[PDB]
Amino acid sequence: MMDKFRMIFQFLQSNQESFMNGICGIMALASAQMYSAFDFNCPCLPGYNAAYSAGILLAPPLVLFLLGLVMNNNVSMLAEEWKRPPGRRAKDPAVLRYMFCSMAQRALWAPVVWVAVTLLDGKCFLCAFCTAVPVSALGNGSLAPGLPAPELARLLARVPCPEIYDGDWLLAREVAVRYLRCISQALGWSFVLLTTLLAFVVRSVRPCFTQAAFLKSKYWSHYIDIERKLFDETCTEHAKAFAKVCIQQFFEAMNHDLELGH
Amino acid sequence: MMDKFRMIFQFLQSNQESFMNGICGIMALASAQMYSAFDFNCPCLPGYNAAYSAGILLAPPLVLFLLGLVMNNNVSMLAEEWKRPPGRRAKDPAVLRYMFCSMAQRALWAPVVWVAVTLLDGKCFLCAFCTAVPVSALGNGSLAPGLPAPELARLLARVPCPEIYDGDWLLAREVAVRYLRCISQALGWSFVLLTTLLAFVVRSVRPCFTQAAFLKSKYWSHYIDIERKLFDETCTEHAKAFAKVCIQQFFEAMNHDLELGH
Amino acid sequence: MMDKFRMIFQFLQSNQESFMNGICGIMALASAQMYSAFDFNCPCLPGYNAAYSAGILLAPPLVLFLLGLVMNNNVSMLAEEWKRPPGRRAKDPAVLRYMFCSMAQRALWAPVVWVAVTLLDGKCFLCAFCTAVPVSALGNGSLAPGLPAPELARLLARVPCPEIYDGDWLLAREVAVRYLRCISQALGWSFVLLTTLLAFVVRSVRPCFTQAAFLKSKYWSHYIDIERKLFDETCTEHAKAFAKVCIQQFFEAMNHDLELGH
Amino acid sequence: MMDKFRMIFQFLQSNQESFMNGICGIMALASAQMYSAFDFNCPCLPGYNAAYSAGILLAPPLVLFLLGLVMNNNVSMLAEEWKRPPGRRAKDPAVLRYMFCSMAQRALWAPVVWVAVTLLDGKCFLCAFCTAVPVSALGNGSLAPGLPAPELARLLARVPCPEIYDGDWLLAREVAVRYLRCISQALGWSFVLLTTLLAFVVRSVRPCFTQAAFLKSKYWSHYIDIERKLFDETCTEHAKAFAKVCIQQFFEAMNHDLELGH
Amino acid sequence: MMDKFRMIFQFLQSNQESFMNGICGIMALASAQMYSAFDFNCPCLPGYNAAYSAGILLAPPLVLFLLGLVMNNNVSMLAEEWKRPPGRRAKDPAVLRYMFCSMAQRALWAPVVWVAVTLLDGKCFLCAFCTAVPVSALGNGSLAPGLPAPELARLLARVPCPEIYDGDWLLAREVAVRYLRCISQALGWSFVLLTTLLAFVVRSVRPCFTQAAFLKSKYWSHYIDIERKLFDETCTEHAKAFAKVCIQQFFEAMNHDLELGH
Amino acid sequence: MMDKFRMIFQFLQSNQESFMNGICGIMALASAQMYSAFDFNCPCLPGYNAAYSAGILLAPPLVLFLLGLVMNNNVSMLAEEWKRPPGRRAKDPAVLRYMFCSMAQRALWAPVVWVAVTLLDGKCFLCAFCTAVPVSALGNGSLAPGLPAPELARLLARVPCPEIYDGDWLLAREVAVRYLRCISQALGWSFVLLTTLLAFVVRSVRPCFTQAAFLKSKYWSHYIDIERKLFDETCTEHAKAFAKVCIQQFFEAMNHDLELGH
Amino acid sequence: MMDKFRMIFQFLQSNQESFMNGICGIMALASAQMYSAFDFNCPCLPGYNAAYSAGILLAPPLVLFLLGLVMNNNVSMLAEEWKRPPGRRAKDPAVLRYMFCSMAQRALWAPVVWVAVTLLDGKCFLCAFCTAVPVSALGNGSLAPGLPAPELARLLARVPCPEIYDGDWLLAREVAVRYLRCISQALGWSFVLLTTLLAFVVRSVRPCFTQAAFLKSKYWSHYIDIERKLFDETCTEHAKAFAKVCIQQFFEAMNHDLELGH
């Protein structure tokens, strides 16, 4: 099971060449790996499955999203100037709208890797649709020998839980699995395809790439840096002149000498 | 079992990029790992469980909290100036109230990782509510064949202790477990979700972020640095002039020469 | 199974000598390895195979292609100046046609390694043509003992799925496999041969290597570098003169002194 | 068993950021690990246990304490000036009392880790109170079938020694153990809690933190450094002028030439 | 199986001392290792073997050859000036003939290591001549008990495929193998001997080592270096004077000020 | 089997202190190790052995010898000036005879380690003289019960091939082996002794150590270094003045400007 | 078996602090380890043992001795000036006698470690005196039941060869061994004791430590260094003036220009 995460492990061990997305690589690479040690096991009960599996395609994604906004050091400047009234805003809506949108496209670089990499291994999908398999399809001389609706859902639904499987009635194990891990791995490619193709279009066309506001932004965020870095200079400077008055008082103020004079 | 902690192990091995929270990463990453080597095993007795399990969601958290306050080098300055009377305080309540609050939000970065990572593996939860499972639910032709209340609590309660399990009466093992590790992993996500979302709000709104007092603080804590660093200069300086009087006395004072003169 | 990817692992661990193709080595080396942890298992059903196997020679290649264009920092400059009308284009078609073509030959350095390295292990090919093996050829006293067409496709088609194989009727297992992994490894060499030989011809002849336009290009892309790097200078410069007016206001504006004066 | 010590092993391998306590980390981290290779096995005899177990909670702690005082380079200066008569002491009782107390709180950082980490694994506690377990409690249809007092102590007392356990009379093995490793791990937390909370109070209040004597101390210990470092200068200086008189005598004093002159 | 390649692995790990051949060591060392992970398994059918084995002594060699020419950065200069007409060639045939020949003797340093290291392990040779072994030689009381020609080729030919071997008729397994891995390892030495001895003669005598043309060559290839390296200087220089006109326009052209003036 | 080569592995890993012999350590240390992965297995047939074993004490040595001459960068200078006629030789026979002899004593540092380290493990010797063991010596009640000459050579000769050994007739296995690995390890010491003792004599006496010609040599080989290193200076110098005429033509020759002028 | 040598392995891996003896540590540490991979197995025949075992306490020691003299770079200077006649010797007998003796005490630092470390494991001693064990001593109801002298030597002598041991007649195996590995390990300590104690005396007293000749020696050996290092200066200097005359001839002598002039 180490394969899905040990790969980025040496890849992390490989080099130190990246960007903000590589800074996102600090987190989401763990998201490529955090799946590995976090186990998965479904109740194999009659109706809980379709509830439970939807838990592991919506919450842990949404967590990794919101942990992207708070993680970067900008949201205050947008949060601060939004709550204030219009007019008083020292920034145009344009620089707001852009700079707000350039937070999403650095955060989304995670909640898409953790929806691929829990489809390609199918576990998330297996416990979610096993209740409705066409049992007549490849059923070893099938025909549903008088089987009812209840007490068959409890027959099908165990399929992922291996050692507690009921038996050969209208199914083997290795044909009900290994046919739901096929259909799953079809979505996993026909999903990641559509997303990356939609990564094309975005850059390639447009949405708030105006040469005007891009300039004002990068100027501004560059300006906050020099402000913080420079304020410390005056403090340490202005403080240095102030310590000399007091520290000297400790000297010449205990005994004006040492008793250890030989 | 190494997975839950070996992950941060190479992640620790990964790089050296962090902050005070990464300084908290020095500790709490161990808290992500300290769970790994510290075993867990419940009494599997009739009433001790619900006592014992609550031991491992309140004490070891609270320890990691208080080890956060004492660990950082500020509490004296707050502790010193609080015990003194008002008025004599060389600092406003504002700089107090802020600087005191900026100790919590650097300490809490632990006692939340050690409440997630002992819910997602369910062991802490399993030995805490096994005494009340609906045995009729998925009970292999159930009906409670005349079973009493006592001598059934001692029947259910063994469920986590594997090799000492009684038997198939109104239960298998792999259906009483693997249904309490489902419910548990639901809280683990629906908890960590709520917390991180509440990490949003805090930064994003406010609570003592006033531009006034933030300035006075960082100036002040910057000032203590130069004071300590500079005091050593005068000492080593003022001492150097003093050693010369005595060290010379050792010379010219033993024999004023060596007998080894050839 | 680690062999196919652990090789580039220490090879990655080996040194840091490469180029843009070695920059492509950042990705496609993973493509040499990403095969390793991504499992493969075919439905072993009557008609799905020839559908499913074609999934793993066209989609995951095409993904690695498009992830090559978006990955490098040029497509905007081509995308921007293409959408505009002719005439307004500040660049000749020649520099366009070349610079556009020099994106392909840096991207193709992947989708050819992931078509070799899933033929040489034959798994991709095995589940794709097992339905039509000449069963009379090496069939252990063959003759097709009255076998029909249906209920034989479901007999042959299981061949890759080992533990669910039907039996010795007109076949053993280790002669239907180990004869489709021969034919496969013949394409894998007679393919990689043809490609590399076609790598010869390209460099060796020509296609838009004109001394004229190559010059204009590398000059231009060199020019964008100095533009971005130099703009930051004026900002940090022009900003530094501006901070001094405000930062001083924070000083001398809170109390013009400290109450901590002893 | 490597877990309890292999953790600090990579943690030691982790980085080199610490202080005098981290200098104590040089020793006590071994004390976190020295437990690992030093085995434990109790006599499983009738009365020796409660003697023997108390051996491994008082001696090996007390050793690690005294190895803390001697390890640091200060005790002579306190030991030297204590044996002398009062009055002649070149240092106030205050600087004595403080500097003596600042030896304990750097030594205690060990003999508390080696009392936790031999309670949390319970072995030290198991062989110490097995002689008095309530056998009627969870005793598999108990009632003490005429059992005497002697020849039952020799029945209970074997409990830790696994392969030499007598048998099922009024006990199984896995219920007499796994109920004394519960009670133990309760002290281990309710102990380490109380200690760390008492680490709070100490810093937070007071005990000889007077601004007066802290100054005189750190000045003094700073002064001993420059004295030792500077004495070597005069020696190597004063010696250099002295060697020239003799070393020249070796020259011009063997033959005033070489016979190897060609 | 790691031995044949793990050797160069630490040897690669050993040091970084080599030349262009060591640059070829970048590739062919993999060719010493690429054999390791690329499996080998022959059809064990009647006539395909002698076809199939010849596949693995001619194609994968020839690939590693052509990947040597294209890999080095010279063939264009030879390819460019060859297609042109004579007379216009700015270089003598001598510098052509030499410089063309000094491409082979740096490429051949591979396709000879991958013909040794797939003879010394004999697998390539075993599946190629098993069809004609003298069965009477060491045949355990032989005499060919009426065996025909067909249905014996299918008897011999299985010999490498272990678990599918027919049986003891006129052969054991461990005497038909372990006599074809002897004859093979004789060629492997009597081949590598002849080649290295022919490496002697080449250097030691001659073939286009003329002092005249060697000079002109190394001068020329040295000249191309300074040309490319120096062209970038004029560009970045000539460009720097050009950016200042436009970048200033962005300044003073958005608002000529900031609205954030307090 | 890793022991014979894993030793030099960490020894190689040990340090980087050596000379030309240590440069030979680059190769022959592999020769100490190349034995490890190159297997050994003898035909166990009647007459081939004494042929085959002599293959592995003469060819692989002789290869490692000739790979020593070609490996060092001197043979051309000797090869070049030998083919020429006497008189024209710019070097005395003395400097020739010495410098030629100082190639052997740096090459022999291999083909002696690969004759020891395939005697001390005896495998090379076992398959070479098993055909003539005195079977009466330690033969478990011997007497040769009417055994003929043929059909006994095929009885003895199998002795190294373990699982195909015939049986107890006039021999066990572990007394025919373990008496030919004794005699072998006697030569291995009484050989390496004689060689190293002959390493004494050589240095210690003489053979072309004349102070005259040693001087001329090391001067000469020192001179070739400065010649090659210095020639590159004039080229890069003389070329630099030449590029400026052409590179400027590319500028001012495409458009004398850019169309991108805004 | 790795223990005897893996120890110095990490000890070698430990640090790089040593001297000429540590330079001897380069070799003899291998001698501490070379025992590990070099196997040992005695003939277990009637009279060869006492011959064979003496082979492994005299030859491999004596080899490591002579490999110490030749290894260091001094013996020529002693060998050269000894063969010459007295009087012509440019060095006194004293500097000879000392400098010759200071070769032994750096060589002996090996052939004593390889006589300890093949006694403490007893294998060398076991196969050397098993022929004469007092069989009556601890002989399981002994009395020598009519056993003869011959056909008992062949009974005792097998004792080290485990699987070929005859049987229980007048002996078990684990009492004839495990009583000859006791007596052996007694010599191993009572030997290494005597040697190290004799290392005391040597330094502590005397043997050619005269202040006169020690001076002349270290001066002399210091002088040879500067001679060799300085000779290279004049060569490279005197050569540099000489190359300029010829290298210029290559220029201006091929064509006095290039045909590539455009």
From Swiss-Prot, chains A, B, C, D, E, F, G:
This protein's record includes keyword Transit peptide: no
Catalysed reactions listed for this entry: ATP(in) = ATP(out); Ca(2+)(in) = Ca(2+)(out); Mg(2+)(in) = Mg(2+)(out); Na(+)(in) = Na(+)(out)
Effect of N140A: Prevents glycosylation and impairs ability to activate the ERK1 and ERK2 cascade
GO CC annotations, alphabetized: basolateral plasma membrane; endoplasmic reticulum membrane; plasma membrane; plasma membrane raft
Region (Central pore), start-end ranges: 10-37
Posttranslational modification: N-glycosylated. Assembly with CALHM3 is associated with N-glycan remodeling and formation of hybrid complex- and high mannose-type glycochains. This N-glycan processing regulates channel trafficking and gating kinetics. Palmitoylated by ZDHHC3, ZDHHC20 and possibly ZDHHC7. Palmitoylation regulates voltage-dependent gating of the channel by shifting it toward more depolarized potentials.
Regulation: Regulated by membrane voltage and extracellular Ca(2+). Inhibited by Gd(3+), ruthenium red, and Zn(2+) and partially inhibited by 2-aminoethoxydiphenyl borate.
Tissue-by-tissue expression: Predominantly expressed in adult brain. Detected also in retinoic acid-differentiated SH-SY5Y cells. Specifically expressed in circumvallate taste bud cells.
Record function comment: Pore-forming subunit of gustatory voltage-gated ion channels required for sensory perception of sweet, bitter and umami tastes. With CALHM3 forms a fast-activating voltage-gated ATP-release channel in type II taste bud cells, ATP acting as a neurotransmitter to activate afferent neural gustatory pathways. Acts both as a voltage-gated and calcium-activated ion channel: mediates neuronal excitability in response to membrane depolarization and low extracellular Ca(2+) concentration.
Quaternary structure (record): Oligomerizes to form hexamers and octamers. Does not form gap junctions. Associates with CALHM3 as a pore-forming subunit in a hetero-hexameric channel complex.
Protein name, as recorded: Calcium homeostasis modulator protein 1
Originating organism: Homo sapiens (Human)
Gene from which this protein is expressed: CALHM1
